[PDB]
Amino acid sequence: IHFEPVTMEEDEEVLYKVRAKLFRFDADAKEWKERGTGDCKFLKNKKTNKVRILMRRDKTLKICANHIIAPEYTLKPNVGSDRSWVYACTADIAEGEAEAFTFAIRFGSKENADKFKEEFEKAQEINKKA
Amino acid sequence: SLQELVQQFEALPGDLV
Amino acid sequence: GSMEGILDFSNDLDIALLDQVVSTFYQGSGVQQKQAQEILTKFQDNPDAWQKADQILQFSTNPQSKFIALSILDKLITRKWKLLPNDHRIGIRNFVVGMIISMCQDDEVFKTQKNLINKSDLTLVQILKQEWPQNWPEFIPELIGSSSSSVNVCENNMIVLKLLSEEVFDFSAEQMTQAKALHLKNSMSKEFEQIFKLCFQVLEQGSSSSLIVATLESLLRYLHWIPYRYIYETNILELLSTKFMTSPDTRAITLKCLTEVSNLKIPQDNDLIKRQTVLFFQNTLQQIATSVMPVTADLKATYANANGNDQSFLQDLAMFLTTYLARNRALLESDESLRELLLNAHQYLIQLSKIEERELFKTTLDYWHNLVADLFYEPLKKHIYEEICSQLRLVIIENMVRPETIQLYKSEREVLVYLTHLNVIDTEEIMISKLARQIDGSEWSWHNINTLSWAIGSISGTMSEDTEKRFVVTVIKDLLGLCEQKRGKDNKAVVASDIMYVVGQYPRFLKAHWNFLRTVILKLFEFMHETHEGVQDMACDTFIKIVQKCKYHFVIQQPRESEPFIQTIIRDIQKTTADLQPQQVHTFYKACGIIISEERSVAERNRLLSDLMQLPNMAWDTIVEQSTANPTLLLDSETVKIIANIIKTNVAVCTSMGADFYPQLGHIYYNMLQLYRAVSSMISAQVAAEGLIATKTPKVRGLRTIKKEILKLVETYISKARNLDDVVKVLVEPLLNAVLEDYMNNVPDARDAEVLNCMTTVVEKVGHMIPQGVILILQSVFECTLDMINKDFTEYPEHRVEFYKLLKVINEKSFAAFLELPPAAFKLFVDAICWAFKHNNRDVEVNGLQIALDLVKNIERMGNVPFANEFHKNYFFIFVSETFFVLTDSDHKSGFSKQALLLMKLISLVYDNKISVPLYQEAEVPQGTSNQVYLSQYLANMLSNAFPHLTSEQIASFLSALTKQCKDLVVFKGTLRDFLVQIKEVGGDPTDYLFAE
Amino acid sequence: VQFKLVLVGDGGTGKTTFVKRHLTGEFEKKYVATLGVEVHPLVFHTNRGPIKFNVWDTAGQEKFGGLRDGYYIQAQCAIIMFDVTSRVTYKNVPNWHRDLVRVCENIPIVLCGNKVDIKDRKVKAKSIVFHRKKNLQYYDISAKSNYNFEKPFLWLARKLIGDPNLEFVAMPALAPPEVDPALAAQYEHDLEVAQTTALPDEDDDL
Ligand SMILES: Nc1nc2c(ncn2[C@@H]2O[C@H](COP(=O)(O)OP(=O)(O)NP(=O)(O)O)[C@@H](O)[C@H]2O)c(=O)[nH]1
Ligand SMILES: [Mg+2]
């Protein structure tokens, strides 16, 4: 007898993932301002093979960074850190419409920062090949 | 059962396998 | 500038323009809202706005605007009521009373504008505080009379009485003078007989619940102060505990009332009071079992569902049960007919204790502590609660939190220890059962095995040693089996950590079974090579935890061993720690230092120390030779890091060995201070070559770390040293030469605040032995540090705190150092103390006031000598007026008590004739005038200019009382508080300062 | 679908810093006292959809109080803030609560003890009991370390929506654009300053 019983990230691959602290430079006040702390991910779209940075804040999971790892971006060190990278971004859409930012990203150790730059450059080659 | 205990405690794998 | 029309008082107030601004502020958004906000603040703060308040209340259609109008009116009643012509006072009263009457008539308004009506009620209560009953004797009689005419008026009168009771009894302490509070309290006490009749009649006869609830809400306030006879010599308990517990409208407030009833002051030897106390508890639990939920109900699930007000009700039920049972449960323990009631009340608490809600659990846990403690000491009680305590054991065990929360764990442990003593057999059975269900997988999870391990570990020391042995063995065997059962590093890591946590909690067991203790330690060493996240930290933390409690068994030669185990540890130390991070190596060395300190044979202790420090001393000797050869080698990040880790290792071992560390300190001391100078030069050179930004670079930050760890090492030893002669003769001279000038001659951004901290410790322990050294410390750090911190309250926060800690200890231990200061520098010392008064930073404020106090004491101890006489002439009235300034400015309320104490000391000096010279200039007042007369004259002028709205009579009475009371700190503080109230208004009563007779 | 939230408490307790942290992720170290009130929309993404809080960040210093309890009219939830390093700020919690519930007689309220990141805690856990009889939710929080910084809004969200299982979820992450010399020299300039300005809090773990 039959008895009847009672994020827009799905199409992507995770190349790299590291916990970091993201800063944005406020040129008016000439000071850095935190933008978020959490997992920074390199996500490769399976339909386009191009990679982006997606970073979310812990707990609230709100996006504090979303932009392509452009081949033209360049990671420069910060004067007061051996575990951070500074670079300008021309179109980040974490706060709505695209906008330009001077970002700084800090990690737990120099090696994680060096590894980040390693992956950051691998990802650039991928966005180059397409 | 004291010697049993140290015996079994020694078998606790330091490499977790 | 369009909405800014209302700010122009030349023209009549355009109500319509007001309602636009108000609407734009509350319902608008963005810039228009922000601009409306500024306009409303400016309009509200106009000292004439109250005059245009009568217009708004009559002709405005916007309830928000009328609310704002009453706020403007409230500011006026509170602060300038007595300054007005008597005409306005009567007028304001009239159209507030009338406005409330009219709103209560329109049932449409009475229900739609509860906010506006409550605000008007509160405004009426402010008038009462000014005018009642001396200028309004008929208020209460006319209130009771008007109540009978309209249900809406009667209900609102209950709101007025509620607010009045709150303003007089609950929130008067700091808002009125003592005399005015007592006046209003007595006034309400007189006329409460008739207030209560009205309240009791409504509760017995009334039908509309809105009026019932409002009457019960006022009753809640009355119970805070009314005599107990109004509750026990009437039928009101019967109504609360039966009638009003049935309807959910009145249930919440009734339950809160009965909670306060359980706190009333009652005879305690009358047997009919005890019956009535039993009776209303019996009725309340009955209504709950029949109208709300039975004692079997799952309150955990009810609370989680969060339907309606269930959560607040279960919270209030927990408060009611715990409050009543903490005070009255004895009334239920002897009568056999009250046993079911006693255990049902506690069974409700059991069910309440299962709710997932941290703060609610803490409330019930506090009661359980109250209970099990009483069952531990009180004869013939524990058998009553056998089944309750059995359930409680499982509840505590299943909700055990992580020990590292810290406060909640200690509370849980305390209750569970008591419960273990009460029935150790039942506790053992529960824990083994819980563990069996972890093994069979029916309750297995990382969270559940951790919770159980914490619970098992929390009861160590409660069982007999023989029972504990058998229990511990069973637990470890089972846990070991659970680990073998599981697969994967993650699972095996959780169980391994829990195994090690438990063993660390049973040192009595470890101390009696060396073979086992050895196996544990050696197994921890194996875990120190495992890289899985958390393992190494767990291994090191368990190592030092076991050592702290079993150290004696590592220093002795255990039977069947060739050497004390400490020697074995030091041998393989390189291999043991090879895979650990630096911070973990330091913990390991610190643990060894704990053991070595147990060796009291000096020659052997020093040898163990030498062997332990072998690796860091060899690394040290090497880089000391390399450093001196090529100073640029210190620019190598790796060399700087090696150096810092060597010093940190010495700090770690010194932290646990204290005085015993001296021989190792002597091995490195002189080369360490040379290193300090060398890195100091490099820091200075980098700042010269790259600017202040260099202080942010990793290079320089690494160099300053070396300096800071050297200072920390020296501070650590001196703070614990036993031979102070050696500290003085060997350590201090080189230390001061190495650090003081470097600090003085670096730019502010390169000065290490740790230098001040290190110096504070030197002065603390050997200050009395190096007076010339203390002088050298002040010269090198006083003026240059003061100039860093006397421009604002923000910059250099670390230097700020250490600066005043250092001055404090010098003022205590070597006051002579300040007597040698030139007069210009001693003036800066005084300026610095007063500067500390003005900080809101508690660290600075508290020390500034203590320095001032100790400084006055130091001067007083000197007697009638020139320096003391000159000090009072120069700085007495500076300290009096600076203390008065922060006392009265409303921005330093956190320091009232210490400000009051300092002020009382200053005043007491004059009225004890401790100041031998006149504090005045002989041309300022006639000769022979006492300092008493002059002090009172100076203060009167000071307060008259600082608070010109006070009458001379107020000032004169305040000072006469403050002076007479300078030997009674509690009364003295009351008079200051009364003064702080009076300066906030106009026309304060000068007789208030006679409150203390 | 927006709720008015009033945020009250003594001056210096961290109300504005707490809100700023939620609005931009920034941690402001300066104490710039709020004047009257500052309204800030704040949106969270939940499994029940987005919820908007209109946060009325009010002033705690009396001389900057503005409309005082006039800011509370028609509020639907509230947060009372104090500073666990300042006993006086906890002493004043009953005063803030009094003035709040006289206007808002039945709203969910969270009591927050801020600044638990500081070692020298002055208001001990066991002293904090005021919330029990007043049926407030209590949380230890730190705007500096983000300890429990989301709990006040999650709890209020659940109370306002009537769903105890409501959860914060990850907002959707749209694909970013794959994007001039006319602006080059202006970025290389702004980037030169950014490199030579040290990142704050370099001793922090992360
Ligand atoms: N250590 C620490 N400091 C904090 C924390 N939160 C805020 N602060 C600091 O406390 C000070 C006051 O911050 P603020 O937000 O302006 O307080 P406020 O309650 O808004 N003051 P007001 O009522 O006058 O507007 C600031 O310096 C801030 O950096 C915290 O969580 N931890
Ligand atoms: Mg603010």
Ligand number nearest CA of D64 is: 1
Taking only residues 55 to 94 of chain A, the set having a beta carbon closer than 8 angstroms to any beta carbon of chain D reads: 56-64, 66-68, 70, 76-81, 84, 86-88, 90-93
Instruction: Considering every ligand atom shown, identify the ligand nearest to the alpha carbon of residue D10 and give its number.
Output: 1
Whether A68 contacts A51, CB under 8 Å: yes
User: Within 10 Å of residue C630's Cβ, how many Cβ atoms?
Assistant: 11
Cα of D53 vs centre of ligand 1, distance in Å, is 21
- Specify the DSSP element, H or E, that contains D110: strand D109-114
- Measured between beta carbons, which residues in chain C are less than 8 angstroms from residue D88? 893-894
Do C39 and D42 meet the contact criterion of CB atoms below 8 Å apart? no
- Residues making up chain C, counted from first to last: 997
Token pair 């010599």: residue? C233
The pair of structure tokens assigned to C342 is 């006693």
Query: Where does C166-208 have alpha helices with state H?
Result: 178-190, 192-205
Return all residues near C459 (Cβ < 8 A) that are at least 6 apart. Answer: C413, C416, C417, C420, C427
Provide the token pair at D189: 């300039």
Phi, psi of D52 (to 5 degrees): -105, 130
Using what technique was this structure determined? X-ray
Is the CB of D115 inside a 6 Å radius of any atom of ligand 1?
yes
**b/e code D177-204 from CB counts within 10 Å (16+ = b):** eeeeeeeeeebeebbeebbebbbeebee
Residue C384: Cβ within 10 Å count: 18
Tokens (6 digits) for C274: 């005890």
- Could you give the CA distance from residue A9 to residue A66 in angstroms, rounded to a whole number? 12
My answer on whether omega of the bond before C133 falls inside 30° of 0, hence cis, is: yes
Query: Starting at the edge strand that comes first in sequence, how are the strands of the sheet with A51-56 ordered?
Result: A63-68, A51-56, A31-45, A12-26, A99-106, A84-92
Q: CA-to-CA distance for D130 and D93, rounded, in angstroms? A: 8
| Phi/psi at D114 (5° precision) | -90, 165
The span from the CA of D186 to the CA of A71, in Å, is 20
Element housing C856 (H / E): helix C842-861
N-term to C-term CA, chain D: 37
- Residue pair D168/D44 in contact (Cβ under 8 Å)? The answer is yes
Which of D6, D7, D17, D38 has most ligand 1 atoms within 8 Å of CB, for mutation? Answer: D17
The separation between CA C148 and the C-alpha centre of its own chain, rounded to angstroms, equals: 49
Upper half-sphere CA count for residue C676 (Cβ side, 13 Å)? 27
Q: CA-to-CA distance for D76 and D108, rounded, in angstroms?
A: 7
- DSSP one-letter code for A99: E
Distance CA(C779)–CA(C821), nearest Å, equals 9
Half-sphere exposure for C553 (CA within 13 Å, toward CB): 19
First to last CA, chain A: 59
Q: Answer whether C50's CB lies under 8 Å from C73's CB.
A: yes
Residue C34 has which token pair?
């922000």
What is the distance between the alpha carbons of residues C672 and C667, in angstroms, rounded to a whole number? Answer: 9
Q: Which tokens sit at C562? A: 């060739």
Are D105 and C163 in contact by the 8 Å Cβ rule? The answer is no
Distance between CA atoms of residues C509 and C505, nearest Å: 9
Tell me the count of B-C CB pairs closer than 8 A: 50
In sequence order, what are the beta bridge partners of A31?
A26
Q: Half-sphere exposure of A6 toward its Cβ, with a 13 Å CA cutoff? A: 0
Q: Which two tokens stand for residue C524?
A: 């921890």
Q: Which amino acid is at D184?
A: A
Residues near C754 by Cβ (< 8 Å), separated by ≥ 6? C707, C708, C711, C712, C715, C802
Helix residue spans in chain D (DSSP H): 15-24, 87-91, 93-103, 130-134, 151-161, 184-195
Considering Cα of C451, then C456, then C457, then C458, what sign does the dihedral take? positive
Pairing relationship of beta strands D137-140 and A31-45 according to DSSP bridges: unpaired
CA distance A19 to C217: 53
| Dist CA C722 CA C732 (whole Å) | 15
Q: Are C773 and C736 in contact (CB under 8 A)?
A: yes
**CB–CB of C489 and B17 under 8 A?**
yes
- C21 near C5, Cβ under 8 Å? no
Token pair recorded at residue A73 = 């971006």
Resolution of the experimental model, in Å, one decimal: 2.4
Q: Which residues contact C619 (CB under 8 A, 6 or more apart)?
A: C642, C646
Topology of the domain covering A1-130: PH-domain like (2.30.29)
Q: How buried is C641 (Cβ within 10 angstroms: 0-12 exposed, 13-18 middle, 19+ buried)?
A: middle
Nearest to C61 by CA among C4, C25, C109, C97: C109
CB atoms within 10 A of CB C369: 15
Interface of D with C in 73-112 (CB under 8 A): 73-74, 85-88, 94-95, 98, 102-103, 105
Of D98, D124, D159, nearest to C171 by CB-CB distance is D98
DSSP state at residue C728:
I
Is the Cβ atom of D16 under 6 angstroms away from ligand 1? Answer: yes
How far, rounded to the nearest angstrom, does the alpha carbon of residue C487 sit from its chain's CA centroid?
Answer: 46
Q: What is the distance between the alpha carbons of residues C233 and A37, in angstroms, rounded to a whole number?
A: 64
CA angle C148, C152, C153 (to 5 degrees): 55
Is B1 in Cβ contact with C480 (below 8 Å)?
A: no
Helix axes C86-105, C151-165, angle to 10 degrees: 130
| DSSP assigned state of C729 | I
Nearest alpha carbon to residue C476 among C456, C497, C499: C499
* Ordered DSSP codes for D144-200: TT-TTTTHHHHHHHHHHHT-TT--B-PPP-PPPP---GGGHHHHHHHHHHHHTSPPS
For CA atoms C193, C103, C81, C89, give the dihedral sign: negative
Phi, psi of A75 (to 5 degrees): -85, 120
Contact C899, C892 (CB under 8 A): yes
Strand partners, D50: D45
For C749, which DSSP code?
G
Residue C322: which H helix or E strand, with range? Answer: helix C310-328
Domain D1-206: assigned CATH number:
3.40.50.300
Residue in A7, A12, A8 with CA at minimum distance from that of residue A46? A12
Task: Look up residue C813 and give its DSSP letter.
Answer: H
Q: What is the CA radius of gyration of chain A?
A: 17
CA–CA separation, C738 vs C710, rounded Å? 11
The sign of the torsion formed by the CA atoms of C804, C806, C812, C814 equals negative
User: Do C519 and B10 count as a contact with CB atoms less than 8 A apart?
Assistant: yes
Other C-beta atoms lying within 10 Å of the C-beta of residue A1: 2
Amino acid at D23: L
Sign of CA dihedral C299, C304, C310, C316: positive
- Which amino acid is it at C363? T
Using an 8 Å Cβ cutoff, are C763 and C777 in contact?
Answer: yes
What does the alpha-carbon distance between residue C496 and residue A56 come to, in Å, rounded to a whole number? 33
Can you tell me the distance from the alpha carbon of C678 to that of C672, in angstroms, rounded to the nearest whole number? 10
Other beta carbons less than 10 A from residue D46's beta carbon = 16
Does the CA dihedral D19-D24-D28-D34 come out positive or negative? negative
Closest ligand 1 atom, CA of D118?
1
Q: For A99, phi and psi rounded to 5 degrees?
A: -160, 150
* Integer-rounded Cα radius of gyration of chain C: 37
- Interface check for A130 against chain D (CB to CB < 8 A): the answer is no
Dihedral, CA of residue C697, residue C702, residue C707 and residue C709, to nearest 10: 130
**Residue A122: exposed, middle, or buried by beta-carbon count in 10 A (0-12, 13-18, 19+)?**
middle
Residue-wise DSSP of C472-507 = HHHHHHHHHHHHHHS-SHHHHHHHHHHHHHHHHT-H
Q: Which residues of D touch C843 (CB under 8 A)?
A: 120
Burial class (CB in 10 A: 0-12, 13-18, 19+), C563: exposed
> Where does C582-647 show beta strands of DSSP type E?
none
Per-domain boundaries in chain A: 1-130
Coil, strand or helix at A14? strand
C-alpha angle C179/C183/C186, rounded to 5°?
Answer: 135
Q: Which H or E run includes A16?
A: strand A12-26
Could you state, in order of their start, the residue ranges of all structural domains in chain D? 1-206
**Which residue's alpha carbon is nearest to atom 7 within ligand 1?**
D14
Q: Which residue range forms the structural domain that includes residue C613? A: 1-997
As a residue count, chain B comes to 17
Query: What's the rounded Cα separation, in Å, for the pair C909 and C414?
Result: 50
Return the structure tokens found at C328.
């009255």
Nearest to C143 by CA among C90, C199, C181, C89: C199
Asked if residue C705 lies in contact with residue C751, where contact means CB atoms within 8 angstroms, the answer is: no
Query: How many separate helices (H) and strands (E) can be counted in chain D?
Result: 6, 6
Distance, CA of A123 to CA of D24 (rounded, Å): 28
Task: Please give the Cα distance from C900 to C898 (Å, whole number).
Answer: 5
CB C289 within 8 A of CB C283: no
- Tell me the Cα Rg of chain D: 19
CB of D117 sitting under 6 A from ligand 1: yes
Q: How many CA atoms lie within 13 A of C403 on its CB side?
A: 20
Nearest alpha carbon to residue C396 among C353, C349, C351, C357: C353
* Secondary structure of C894-958 in HEC code, one letter for each residue: HHHHHHHHHHHHHHHHHCCCCCCCCCCCCCCCCCCCCHHHHHHHHHHHHHHHHCCCCCHHHHHHH
Give the containing element (helix H, strand E) for C16: helix C15-26
Q: How many Å apart are CA D90 and CA D130, to the nearest integer?
A: 9
Tokens 């540890």 correspond to what residue?
C569
Chain C hits for A106, CB-CB cut-off 8 Å, are: none
Q: Which numbered atom of ligand 1 lies nearest the CA of D59?
A: 23
What Cα–Cα distance (Å) separates residue D73 from each residue in C125, C673, C887, D37?
A: 20, 66, 34, 13
Contacting subunits of C (3+ beta carbon pairs below 8 A): A, B, D
**How many domains would you assign to chain C?**
1
Sequence-ordered list of residues with C-beta below 8 angstroms from that of C930, at least 6 positions apart, any chain:
none
